[PDB]
Amino acid sequence: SGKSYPTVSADYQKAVEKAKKKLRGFIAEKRCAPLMLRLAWHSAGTFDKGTKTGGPFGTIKHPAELAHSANNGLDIAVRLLEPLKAEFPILSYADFYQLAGVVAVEVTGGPEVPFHPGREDKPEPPPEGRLPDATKGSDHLRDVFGKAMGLTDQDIVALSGGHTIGAAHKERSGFEGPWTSNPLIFDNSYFTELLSGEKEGLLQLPSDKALLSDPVFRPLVDKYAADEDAFFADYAEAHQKLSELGFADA
């Protein structure tokens, strides 16, 4: 694992458990799981291992980081969460947004991603430009997830299945529509649809398509399309790692 999780107080631990339950009801009612998942992923995916900059350290709430074009629309997510966060002043924003990401997966029917508290809020956003480009292919994915974040090729494929919930918006990225027929249900449908090719009303980004043609990504796509249990396992492993980049000695 390579992780040493810090100690937090009993009151901090109580606030986590209470916030997890409040976040479930809220995120379920507001129907905003995919947006919250996108928020935690964009917050965490700025980590660069060589410099140990970026990562899930609460800087995504900064107007400066929200302005990054890859984060178009995430100011909505931040705004939605601010009243709830105010009820848990003991929690770092880093912990709160990561926990909201975990919850987003859980309440849509997804795996139970393990959560460890202790992220401290960092003073300055990372540089813009570290997040992936939907028009690019497999070398780019490996640059971003592997060379920067330090994730594996398996992680890239499983985390891409994050697209099993939610949708693109032509006013945000310019892409438009859901990847799946059930955008509020977390399951292995992203991989099913990607394999079955194009279907009316359904989205596939070039970055999604790049997974089909890579000798390593493709068998993972196939495995996940065949076995949702194996997708859920690899997904929970990868999300945990992502949510913990630069935190607790990795």
Ligand code: HEM
């Ligand atoms: C593999 C590289 C990736 C690229 C190029 C990419 C790109 C995109 C784009 C362009 C959108 C639509 C933005 C919009 O117009 O609203 C989107 C949405 C989304 N992404 Fe990704 N993404 C990637 C990976 C991931 C990962 C790793 C996760 C989390 C595990 C994730 C979770 C989501 C979710 C849940 C949505 C829907 C947001 C909503 O419904 O509002 N994506 N992604």
Ligand SMILES: [K+]
């Ligand atoms: K789905």
